[PDB]
């Protein structure tokens, strides 16, 4: 009880850089380099372990929960801030004044609010709209001042911590599978517009007192949960908008992917492209609009881009006749009237992967002579510890004689590598001293490798074409 | 002295399978991943070790030691026969019919040779040569049977085992720099035009004492040199012409130098592409014809494929007046008149690698605002055991206020990944609640990324363009 309510937080000991802190896995057990046979396709897929570390200010508000959230509102720096549940710290308050950031008030912008709480404070704000809605009785409707984050997803941690955002919202929202995305079946990317409308600061304190009216005691605000690991916070700022979120997923598991995907926002010329072509036919785009301006559980699922553009600008602009929600937050620890940022860390296993695709070696012989030919090529896979394993193999019918008309068909894995074809006229004793024909080495695995072999014992001719 | 050529020779006990084997290195260990720097360039190498085995009939001679091999010769399979240097097995000698493989000479290739030695076999190949110049007294010339061959180079042992030659062969005539080539400060490749005028045979033995004058013995055989450990074997057949190696070398560390290469061999338009005329700047092409006709230690070093093209087409064809030098033979076994084959094994470290180039990010700001930036990247480098690693870097510039005309340039480093610009309208509180003026994510590393700003307070305007 020898304590008074500015000794008594000034004496709390805690790390601002630590109070809130998010920590993720880090990570679990994994091969760097995974070989997998999937439809008439061979997937490689390259793991690394990746290490974030983000030390955010401004911080999500969950809808649900909104009511904790509002300026110069208190709340506890414990792991329940950090999960977006905050708790409140509510006790009997002195006045404070609070000033939103809308344009023609310079000005006439601020109000002081006697009982901070979320009802009063919201009237408060909704009276300044009033103000401002008389003087700007024309222009109602306003844009939004837009921020855009964009980022493939790798775990549920890890784009937690990329777009600042409560996991379960996007989970639950957008609809993620997080073991599609792991087990590399599904590439996802999201976006978010963050449109914000305007903000509302309130007035910081002097010292801490003068926050809480004199008959609240330091005892009263430990009883509330004031302590060394829960500390007290102002929220000092608080934006007022809503949020779109668009999450671009397909089944393809190509290099080129995350380029497509970032041709296709742009609208660039790339876009075009057969080799993107086949990544959109296997891609679904889904967006939501979250804050309180649009109705809940709205959705926008397509394989045409030019809807979601459309969602995107049709929420950039807001009313001010209609009431807008708060979407995030700063507060200020009250020891120190210093910003709290959330120390985020996590480790994730970003997965990168390449299609390779089955084929096959067509043979023509039209020629007036007889052939012997010499088709080889590898199959890689893939140790436990991601080296490359290279098992060779062969044609069976290499270096037997064969006249016009012959025709044959090589079909190779998708994992054929370092494929070679060799063709010699067999006028003479053996294979070793005969005249090549066609003699191809590294020949690249395409769907059709059609090589054909024609002519006379003078003129003889041959060919190696693909499809 | 209890035995018979034929039964002393039946009881030699080898492997016939691994009497001739030839193995290469095991080691040495290696960074399966490493990152370096070389100027404006950062390359980047992965190693994987490769094994490589072949069991080929047709091996090498080196002309220094020619007069060792000719059809009909006895050699020891030694160790020696192994390093193209054989041991030849001279004794007194039965007659031996050689036939020729000279076109339209069906039932007249043929003759007898009584004593065979290097000298009478020469003699009577001379006489089958001057024998098909009469009855083909018009065509004086004719077009040599090529085979091609192709490899890029990693170690002495492989490209000896690839492309079937003596290693010093190719390091003395071509002046291949395996240090180089291991430290990736040269990607070299290497073409043989394995071109055969005819070939000349043996009759084989339906015993082994049908080569043997009936005054030699085993003890005779024994004391020069015949063992289990050297077995005697017979020339059966040799092949006479020559052979045009190729060399492609270069600085150039980029993924695309064999695709290139190849590209100018094959001769295809895709040669004109400006990615491989920059490969193409820095590589030397150069071109040794080892055989008979050509003179000894002649050469072509260019920068202009057509010289090396020229080469090989003025070698087509072959004068039948002209004496022709052994290029190639196959031996077989008296023991069972099985062909010898050397076996080949080897380890090697195929090393593959990619290019990064330095870039800049060009800032330019004639916007009718106060604006601020937040640009950020991760520059790679590898461990000791080839995993990447990120360290995060960031503009010293980033939240803090510019205003029109501001210009700056950020370099970076050839090892930047993950680049990030962002740039924000400062209308309102802070950072957090700014409108992004631009905002890019992933941006690809290029020589420039020019980031320009533009407009006014109300109505801002951007680009992001790369050259």
Redesign the interface.
């Known amino acids: 009880k020898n304590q008074s309510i500015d000794s008594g937080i000034s004496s709390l000991s805690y790390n601002r850089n630590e109070v809130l802190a998010s920590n993720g896995d880090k990570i679990e057990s994994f091969v760097?380099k995974e070989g997998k046979k999937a439809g008439n396709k061979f997937i490689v897929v390259e793991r690394?372990?990746?290490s974030l570390?983000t030390s955010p200010?401004?911080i999500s508000i969950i809808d649900s929960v909104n009511d904790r959230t509002y300026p110069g509102a208190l709340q506890l720096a414990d792991k329940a801030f950090v999960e977006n549940r905050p708790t409140i710290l509510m006790v009997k308050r002195k006045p404070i004044n609070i000033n939103i950031?809308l344009p023609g008030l310079k000005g006439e912008n601020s109000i002081k609010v006697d009982d901070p709480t979320y009802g009063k404070v919201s009237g408060a704000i909704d009276e300044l709209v009033s103000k401002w809605n008389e003087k700007y009785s024309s222009t109602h409707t306003l844009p939004?001042?837009?921020?855009?984050?964009?980022?493939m997803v790798y775990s549920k941690s890890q784009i937690s911590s990329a777009l600042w955002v409560n996991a379960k919202v996007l989970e639950n929202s957008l609809g993620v599978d997080f073991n599609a995305v792991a087990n590399n079946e599904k590439k996802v990317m999201i976006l978010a517009y963050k449109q914000?409308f305007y903000?509302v600061?309130a007035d910081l304190p002097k010292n801490p007192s003068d926050l809480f009216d004199d008959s609240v005691t330091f005892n009263d605000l430990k009883q509330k949960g004031v302590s060394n690991e829960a500390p007290p916070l102002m929220v000092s700022?608080v934006?007022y908008g809503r949020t779109i979120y668009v999450k671009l997923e397909t089944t393809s598991s190509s290099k080129d992917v995350?380029a497509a995907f970032?041709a296709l926002i742009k609208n660039t010329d790339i876009k075009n492209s057969q080799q993107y072509k086949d990544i959109y036919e296997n891609s679904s785009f889904t967006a939501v609009v979250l804050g309180g301006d649009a109705q809940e559980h709205n959705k926008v699922v397509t394989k045409d881009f030019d809807e979601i553009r459309k969602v995107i600008k049709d929420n950039a602009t807001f009313s001010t006749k209609n009431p807008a929600y708060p979407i995030?937050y700063?507060s200020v620890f009250l020891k120190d009237n210093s910003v709290a940022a959330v120390h985020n860390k996590t480790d994730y296993i970003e997965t990168t992967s390449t299609e390779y695709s089955k084929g096959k070696i067509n043979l023509d012989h039209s020629g007036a002579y007889v052939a012997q030919f010499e088709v080889a090529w590898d199959e890689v896979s893939y140790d436990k510890e991601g080296?490359?394993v290279?098992t060779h193999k062969t044609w069976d019918g290499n270096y037997q004689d064969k006249t016009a008309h012959y025709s044959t068909v090589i079909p190779l894995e998708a994992n054929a590598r370092n494929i070679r074809i060799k063709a010699?006229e067999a006028t003479?004793?053996a294979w070793?001293?005969?005249?090549?024909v066609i003699?191809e080495?590294?020949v690249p695995l395409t769907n059709n490798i059609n090589v054909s072999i024609w002519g006379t014992t003078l003129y003889p001719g041959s060919s190696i074409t693909y499809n």
Chains 1, 2 share one sequence.
């Open positions: 760097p690394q372990k990746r570390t200010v401004d950031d939004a001042r837009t921020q855009y984050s964009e980022s914000i903000t600061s700022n934006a995350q970032k995030s700063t080296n490359e290279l010699r003479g004793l070793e001293w005969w005249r090549d003699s080495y590294d």
